[PDB]
Amino acid sequence: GIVEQCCTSICSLYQLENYCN
Amino acid sequence: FVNQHLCGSDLVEALYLVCGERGFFYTDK
């Protein structure tokens, strides 16, 4: 999921940027 | 945004540099 890949570790930058809205 | 665990803060932090603002967001979904 989100935190699962962003908090527990590091997610993809472009994917982390898609977090916008 | 280096690779060393991010979580909310880092997100909103990176998100603050990857998007700047424009009302960005980041949830568990």
Curated annotation (Swiss-Prot), chain A:
The protein here is known as Insulin A chain
Q: Which domain of life is it from?
A: Eukaryota
**Disulphide connectivity of cysteines:** C6-C11
